[PDB]
């Protein structure tokens, strides 16, 4: 096996998580500057610690449903050089896991390689996301 640490959050009735090594920080959705004529799923840019970070709507990227009133958190993650803020409903906490409580049942094909598998915790499912593959998808 191996010990895994992930961050679990909720996008309305559905719980997800990605690998904690990629997170910089989780801030509160405060103020976002629109960037006209950009993709439908980008919300805009924010100023964070004096740098520009794009904020995207994770729900719109995955294709699951969301309620705008509830998008209250921003998970700021990075892979290599690229840094991105993912807008989610609420953070739930950190989970310590092992690739053997990692159920790989093929429930759907919607999330492509964005999905890494299910994690069963007390019989309560959480989708494990490949954060890199989400960022890779979202760039060029």
């Amino acid at each position: 096996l191996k010990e895994f640490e992930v961050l679990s959050f909720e996008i309305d009735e559905q719980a997800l998580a990605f690998d904690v090594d990629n997170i910089e920080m989780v801030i509160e959705k405060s103020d976002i500057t629109p960037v006209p004529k950009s993709r439908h799923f980008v919300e805009g840019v924010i100023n964070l610690r004096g740098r520009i970070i794009p904020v995207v709507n994770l729900a719109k990227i995955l294709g699951i449903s969301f309620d705008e009133q509830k998008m209250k958190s921003i998970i700021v993650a990075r892979t290599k050089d690229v840094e991105v803020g993912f807008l989610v409903d609420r953070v739930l906490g950190v989970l310590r896991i092992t690739e053997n409580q990692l159920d790989l049942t093929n429930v759907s094909d919607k999330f492509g390689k964005k999905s890494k598998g299910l994690v069963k915790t007390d019989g309560r499912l959480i989708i494990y996301l490949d954060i890199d593959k989400i960022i890779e998808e979202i760039t060029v």
Partner: protein, 131 residues
């Protein structure tokens, strides 16, 4: 003749027959603990993750009363198994598979019909054709 034992099941007033050879179990699930996974809904029973399909949605039949407790047949296609919510659990029965002819050639969802006791029709679910 081709006899086969099957679970008789209902959606509104319509009768569908699921060959018993394909049923794994029959539970009673409660809305309360279905979970949304991607686009699909699942129950997890004894750590086993089973996607549930409403039968009326699978067949596009008008229907609304989605009760809080509902009866569901779990079926099995090869090595993957999956749930099928229904309205009523009519009963087990022995039916004669009749083919529903050349005009339904394309309907993957069924695999024939049966004439019941009172001469009413049941169509036989083709479990490996209901997604």
């Amino acid at each position: 003749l081709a006899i086969i034992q099957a679970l008789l099941v209902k959606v509104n007033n319509l009768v569908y027959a699921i060959p018993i050879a394909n049923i794994d179990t029959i539970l009673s699930i409660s809305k309360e603990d279905i979970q949304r996974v991607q686009d699909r809904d699942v129950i997890v029973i004894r750590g086993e993750v089973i996607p549930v399909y409403r039968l009326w949605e699978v067949l596009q039949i008008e229907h609304k009363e989605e009760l809080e407790e509902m009866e569901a047949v779990i079926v099995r296609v090869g090595n993957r198994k999956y749930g099928i919510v229904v309205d009523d659990l009519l009963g087990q029965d022995d039916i004669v598979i009749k083919s529903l002819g050349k005009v339904f050639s394309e309907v993957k969802e069924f695999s024939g019909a049966a004439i019941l006791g009172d001469g009413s029709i049941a169509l036989i679910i083709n479990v490996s054709g209901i997604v």
